[model samples]
Target: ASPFRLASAGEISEVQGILRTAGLLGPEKRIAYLGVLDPARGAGSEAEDRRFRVFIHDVSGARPQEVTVSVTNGTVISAVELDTAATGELPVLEEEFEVVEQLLATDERWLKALAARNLDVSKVRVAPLSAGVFEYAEERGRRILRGLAFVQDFPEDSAWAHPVDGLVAYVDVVSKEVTRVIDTGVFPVPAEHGNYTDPELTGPLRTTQKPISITQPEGPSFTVTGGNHIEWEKWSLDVGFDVREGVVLHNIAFRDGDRLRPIINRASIAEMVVPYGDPSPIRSWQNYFDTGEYLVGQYANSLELGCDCLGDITYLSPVISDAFGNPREIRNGICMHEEDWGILAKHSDLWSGINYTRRNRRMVISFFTTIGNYDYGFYWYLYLDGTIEFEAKATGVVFTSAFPEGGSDNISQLAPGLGAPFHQHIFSARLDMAIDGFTNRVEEEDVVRQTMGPGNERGNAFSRKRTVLTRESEAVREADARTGRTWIISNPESKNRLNEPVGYKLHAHNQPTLLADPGSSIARRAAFATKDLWVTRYADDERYPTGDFVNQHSGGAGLPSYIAQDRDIDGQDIVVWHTFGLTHFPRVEDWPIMPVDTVGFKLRPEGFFDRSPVLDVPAN
Candidate 1:
């Protein structure tokens, strides 16, 4: 640990201790933004391992902040910032905003304060979020990073501030010094711009991620540039949208020429949407939780889109895709629990960090609790080099309910709230994920799920556990009404758009089933074992209809599962859903809340892992 001090904070050890307790990021333990750091990209340090990059975070608050630091080494080629105030380009993110249903829901003194401030400005106006791509310096050369591109709006409600952090940022592993830090007064939210109907829309969403191995493109990364399709190349932006007072819900949208958009089903839905709309020049995080008895939290998950493999939507469309619609964090895919997990999770992490990793190759962090309970949210930071970073932290209080179980005692009849209720377990959650390494996913291709605990199948924990085999693509049955079934085409509504609708359909197997054999009672011992059905089998239970649908919230005599309609609070509608990305279960040892502990799997570069595998690639 190098002796360093914040000129303002004074004491080195005092600040260092505070950093140790609060800071999180790059390999060198420097405070960074989201999960990006600037490496010394200018020159020299050639022999050095591209590890550690430096990043900066706002230190205005006393609360714990999330600092992701699990990035793969690269180089901080450059760092720069643009003048938003001078150019009237970047917008100051305000801290005041009005809710949609009701601008002011309360009459307390605090509520009155909100009304007194300016709350009518636009939160995310493209004019601000898409100003300029400041020049960045790296050992390689000067490179420019842009601002919000497709969808625009970084408001007070938007959790993870994208452009605000990404605008002038780049990473370098060798130097251990994150370079770019542009306090634009207004910054862009680190997210894509194009909307669902954008002609540049493309996908190989995780839902369809199968065939474990991925071959390099026989041709270059792209072919049809200016002709037939609308190309949406991934580029950095220097945006400044006000999220709070100065801005109300605002964004810029354009028509997609020939670009294709992905289709979405209930199983997967992921997008960083602010219920309050675009970025407002206001960013008042404290006032948000200042008052109120019951706190709000959220939960979410990402899915890579297809298990059906039946059409163009089942795979990535290179014609419009930047690099093969390969699932990167945000754009990859997601499925969220809790009504507003996606956005709320982002906000929660803004103040709290359970676990986070922000390095060059992979930057991930999740704030488990804060802003209260039952919260959910995650972030996906994709680098220019295609390195994938993920971060999602959930907050909220304990959500409890009572249910009737034939086996457990019906003690509620006499001793209410006493004794564990029948048909009830405190908190049990299981989710499956598989990255689409294949260009087009197909049946039995290479289904997978991330594993947690011991050296079991694809484990994802940092404590003594080998992280190498943590996340893997496993196989499963994604029900399709293809051949003789009518599920896919059985929508009773003439206008209904779903293979499975909002109805109760349960299946059960009276047999002992293979579930019991999968575990030894306690979840920890049986946590990562393939034999245990805790996560998968429980979801696939042949015994008692497995309780509820994987898409439903658990709440019945069974596992208490349910499905809430996907509704973006704002006017935005989801066009495509990249489904089932990385999956991981938190073990007791894995906690105290972790830095975004990214689910790890083999990301061996072509020829790097195996020579002969190149033949698997399609020869142009």
Candidate 2:
């Protein structure tokens, strides 16, 4: 029996009742997040009991508390109040989003600013953003959300198209008051409606394209059991979702002969940071930890068939605790289906005129989340050839601000007087790797050219240079496209036919890391984005790369702090954190609605498999 099942609605309600009975919940306190507590590493034998970790936000105390509750025993295990000054505030709650609108309505300065600009206050839509660290005295030790205003002619109109630039409001959610309002200057608002959905604004729907339909005569080639556990081809894993990291895969393993080989114990996009390049006062403090601050999973879109997914699909509903500790279901939050991946292998004998080919198929597990103006799709693909891939599809309206006819280099002019700032969405994927077993080591493999000598007369000889990452400090590395760099995570105890350690190679995309200056606040707070890969010794509590809390964090709390110990990782249980993303310089084509921009990495079986695992795949 698998112990990695997600917390059920009844389990969540039971835990909430236990916490409330223990005086942990009240009118002034509410649940921030609640998820299944993962069993400690190497403790799979003790899986009979189920426990849950609950994060509570104390509004009256202005602090967050962590509590562990046992559902089987109906008792509280432990509780502790987190230090917001050090660990930062908990994720912004769903109810807290309304606080900004409520506070702005009563504020005279906010209303007067709209009146001074001659903008209709009623049509204004305020987006509550995570307030990055700044030197404001009033903002210190307070839960703050910076509000940016946008205008919409009607409720259905796209508010992102018309930006009320240069005006910002800082609101304290706990105090229920507006701290300060910064109105840089009055700027011209974009006149364009930026409505892509309305046919009236788009003139007419395209009639040239022919209708295409996708059908599966048979049902999906996958089986889901025990709610979250799934098996597709030779791949088996458990799907789990929480308020922080949206979609988490657990106990990822592949079947080799009669043995189920463990690849990764758990994997998820633990945290993501979006840092803007514009230096304007209104935009400089624009770095946001989407997963940690906003709890991106809480806003997951209920996926629709045909529109969000095609072909035979199986949907999984994720049960999450609301702000008041009530279990709420995001129906169809996860979509799983099989996709045709062109060709898996092909060969043709020229002399004998014989041919052999096999079509490739991959199972995709994905979920979409809408934070504000932008939407992100997180996809996990498992192939028949024992390869795993994660892709993030970024789409929706680009964040906009008003600019002059000729915008600065940092701004991409989408329309006249409408500019989108350049930014980078850096994502950190936490891979708790278990190649064959728990003891694993990482080696950096770079293809290096041999020096011309007696051994290489033509200087054409090149070989892979393998370097073992012995410690956490040495494991902090980057991708080098010049060398075709790759990291191999191998288990020394498990050996293939050639007596080589079984391993999987990490293929990383050589994208720019954080572009913020070293001395900047964003750089300090988002230190995990400064590198392409980080190897940390596995610890049960070290799940998120940006620590447990990231809302308005000071700095040096996550990866930097984790690696500060510089623990030995050679042939030890280790976790790999890969930072992969794209730096976006918006284009005019991205206006209204942007196409899906995909970025991610792949993990392919290296020495883990003795030979081509797909040789037995039947021809289609």
Candidate 3:
């Protein structure tokens, strides 16, 4: 069995039982996170290799705790309490969603705000949002979720269309109190019904397009072993799942002749922050850490065949625990299949009177999660030509608020009296790379033009410049389109046929990073999104880019803290953290439901292979 395998249902149960028996968990305590502990980080015996790390939220003490329990030994390994101010707080509990509405039902200020808008409190849906860091005295050291109201005329009506803008309610779930309510002012709610499913609202479905179908007559080419391990063509990897980060790929490798060369040891999106640009008090503190604060994996959508996916598909159902530490399964949580990607290579030799071409095929592993009004599709592609790519597909409804006919700089008018706030979804992907082995280093490559001197008399000469990133501080870099910048992860121990170090090149998208001011609260809390790339020496405990806790975090954690050591990264086992995403300016066409907008990066072979790995592929 793979050491990175997710904790089984029985193992989770056993670990919970032991923790309960040891008086570490009870009614007053809730398991915020429970997952298999990395054996590489454990100092236990061989018998205690199978251990589970449990993060408990003690409501009675208003604190967070950690406990390591070994299911194999049936004993608790270690337990410690974390500082609340330092770590912020655990992900919001599922039960808190219900408590927010209940707590708001009795708040006089919230009810009066609805009455002022001539809206019924019963028809309003209160959404629990992560209250970002601020200097509010009442919200200090409290487990709170900012409540945003939306009016839903019917049970099936889309409440998102009728937002009760400018009214913000701060609810403390721990104390069961509505601490404060900020009412900027009531604006005219858009009368347009944003229901796309209703036939009356949409009028008629398009009938001009013909039916298209994708069929795999020979079935899928991939094989799954031990449930999580997957092998397709020359690529192989293990699929892992966490309650926070949905899909994690482990032990990614490719077959090179007689040897299975390692590329990435583990890969997953560490964290994502969606910060709205609206400066109004109602939305100024609008940055959200979806993975850390809300838990994206926990809200994974159950995909269906012919709907979310097509062709001969294989699905992996991931088992997760609820807030009460009970096992639950997300059926079809992960989808795996092959896609025909146009052409791999093509050539038409006119002089030789011969044409040569090869079709491209790629294996796609993907999953979708809905966070509030937006839906995100996370896709990882493994190509036949030894290329790895990750794409984030953003779709679903755009978050809107009530505004005048003409929108401001931070908002775009989607409809009359309806405005969608501009926002950016910055995603941090942690690549624990082992190109050929663990001894790997990072190098920055940029294209440069010669200064039309002795070397460039014609004034058309260009060259490539390579710089070794020796330390963590020097490795903080950004993507440059003008220079065609790229980063290489090379293993000096392994050499290609040309005597060059085997390596893979990281192709980053030259998109905008965090647009917030350098001294802004969001910029401090989500500092990982401030740069395009960050390289650091590998450490087992250094997983998430946003640190363990992100809810209302003060600042200076995760990557900022990790790189503070400024350790040497040259020719050492290192991890690459790439921040890439989309800066969305909502358009009129994105109304009701937004189309899928894709953003991601690619990792292509640099000198890792002696020749084209797909040259021997049989002609189809």
The numbered model that scores best in TM-score is 2
lDDT of 1 by residue, 361-399 (tens): 221222222332124443333222222223334332221
Backbone Cα, N, C clashes tallied per candidate: 161, 0, 0
Model 2 lDDT per residue over 499-559, tens place: 9999999999899898888888988888889999999999877888878878888886789
Please report, in order, the local distance difference test score of every candidate based on alpha carbons: 0.20, 0.89, 0.88
Error of 2 at 429 (Å): 0.5
Worst 10 residues of 2 by lDDT: 40-49
Q: Is candidate 1 or candidate 3 better by lDDT?
A: 3
Residue 34, model 3: Cα distance from true site in angstroms: 1.6
In angstroms, give how far residue 308 of model 2 lies from its true place. 0.1
TM-score of each: 0.20, 0.98, 0.97
lDDT for 99 in candidate 2 is 84
Which 10 consecutive residues of model 3 have the lowest summed lDDT?
A: 39-48
Which candidate's lDDT is highest? 2
| lDDT at 479, model 1 | 21
Q: Residue 157: error of model 2 in Å?
A: 1.0
What are the runs in model 1 whose C-alpha is more than 4 Å off? 1-361, 365-372, 381-391, 402-620
